[model samples]
Target: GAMAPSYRVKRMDIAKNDEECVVNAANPRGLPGDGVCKAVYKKWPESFKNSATPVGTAKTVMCGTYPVIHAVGPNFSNYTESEGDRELAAAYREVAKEVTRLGVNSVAIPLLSTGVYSGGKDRLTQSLNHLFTAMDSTDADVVIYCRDKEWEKKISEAIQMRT
Candidate 1:
């Protein structure tokens, strides 16, 4: 697969970002049942206002501190590899589109389903690859945030390999 030159990918820890928008993955049942979303919603309850989440749909929430690109996922009950990859692609696509819509240049994305709903290292790695692959096709300054140093290294290596 060929990637466009407009895409620029970077590795960083999330939390403090001056990027125009931050991207988040949701469970599509109105909000993420667990993981990072829980904590974030607790702090910024306003993000969850007037929510009717649809699978594979992207929603933008403008909050007090910053703007959020909240993209909900397809049903994860079975977690088939093909469906998982497609949902992730849709989320990433919406993310890039939303960033452009808001006249933003950067977005921070985390591993969508590797939190309380992971398969394993290899599985998470595959998910990470999907996110990175999207970066190769977007014009935005994209940052992939991993909370673990081990994962950071693995994601870095995986991106270098660039499947």
Candidate 2:
């Protein structure tokens, strides 16, 4: 068989990523006031807005050098376990679709919904499956950015499990 399509997980600052697109886990209000959202917003002020981006969907806006895909991930407190699963899956899938639509060769994305939205490591584990599956459909080179060691380890373990 030919090489399997896949994405790499790395511990790095998303802001340092030079990919053509960077997917941000956005809030319903698309506010970039915290976490990685703040990093993205601070760099690309043009993408700053106060519009509602519903959960499990995504919208794209042109930032300074490249476009940013704002994907709304599920806030687990507002959703049942199963419901959160589906929504998280959709969020990752939507991001992949947007990356393909943008026709970019490279994209960097973070683990969505695992921040103040209250999705901890367990939630991060579940999200990996959705992210991995979604990335398979895209031809672009994908890099999953993680802010720290814990997430980087989790993603590494997930990749090993897949192989």
Candidate 3:
């Protein structure tokens, strides 16, 4: 089968001081000093905002010049196994669709459940795989930006296998 040519995955050590750049994540609160994505967002004012709603919700807002579709995942504040993961995946797909609807050419996303919500690697990877597969047919370029090497590897492998 011939796959589409617009999809791609790239790796970069985003947490490092020198490699500081804006990466995307399912961060709801836009917690400052959180990590790579948050740090980058914090460095420049008027570049970030916490537009996410409650769990299982997603929103689209502008981060400076970048149009971001921020999706909320299960929060560590209150967690559940069975429903949380499913909601997270659903939010990811919903936000991706909105991004496409806006006619954006490129989008960046992070490991949805791999952070504070503590969805295990395999589950998070599975969620991402499902989301990316759903997005593969779209014209938008989905960039799974990671804050570290381990995440970079995980996302790259997931995209390769599915897309």
Candidate 4:
């Protein structure tokens, strides 16, 4: 017998989880904002709000298990400015790269381009596109963390449209 493939993508409801890790979008502030992700980060050993460096962009900081994956999402200004998508894509790739490199098969991710980041629909699409590229050919499974039922639907529909 042969393995079909090492990759998959799907939608999930609230309070659902993967066997291993989740990736969250964080800003230069390194502070978890007013979201469920923030609450989850709150349980971490330290405050992510204040970082020694300003919002480690293009970087993944171990901020561990429950083993959370946090990429430095650009600020609203930076996100909308030149090359924003590139940076955001890098962030997603960073997390996804970790997924396969570490043998953590399941990864949860929030919308990296929306909310405080002032991201747009197209950018969100770009970000999702990047996730597929990032995790392509790997056995990793990713979950989209949503704000609510509406957000869940919005993102799920978009994901469906794209792939």
**Can you list the residue pairs that collide in candidate 4?**
6-138, 6-139, 28-55, 30-48, 30-49, 31-49, 64-67
Return the TM-score for candidate 2, rounded to 2 decimals: 0.88
TM-score, prediction 4: 0.69
Off by over 4 Å in 2: 1-6, 49-51, 119-121, 160-163
Model 2, range 7-70, lDDT digits (tens) per residue? 6788877988967788877787877658888888877768755435899998888876588899
Question: What lDDT is reached at residue 93 by model 4?
Answer: 66
TM-score of each: 0.75, 0.88, 0.71, 0.69
Write one digit per residue (lDDT tens) for candidate 4, span 1-163. 1133333334453225554666656555555665544654665535353432334243344444455555665655644555676676676666666666667656666666666665434355566666677666567566666655665566677666755
lDDT of 2: 0.80
With candidate 1 superimposed using the best TM-score fit, by how many Å does residue 82's alpha carbon deviate from the native? 2.7
Q: What is the C-alpha lDDT of each candidate?
A: 0.63, 0.80, 0.56, 0.56
Query: Residue 29 in candidate 4 has what lDDT?
Result: 52
Task: Indicate the residue-level lDDT of 131 in model 4.
Answer: 65
Evaluate model 1: give its lDDT.
Answer: 0.63
User: What digit string (tens of lDDT, one per residue) describes model 3 on residues 79-130?
Assistant: 6666776776677677657766676665555656666556433455655765
Query: After TM-score superposition, what is the CA distance of residue 110 in candidate 4 from its true location, in Å?
Result: 0.7
Question: For this target, which candidate reaches the highest lDDT against the unseen true structure?
Answer: 2
In model 1, the runs with Cα more than 4 Å from the true position are 1-13, 119-121, 160-163
Considering only N, C-alpha and C atoms within 3 Å, which residue pairs clash in candidate 3?
none
Return the number of clashes found in candidate 1.
Answer: 0
Clashes (N, CA, C under 3 Å) per candidate: 0, 0, 0, 7
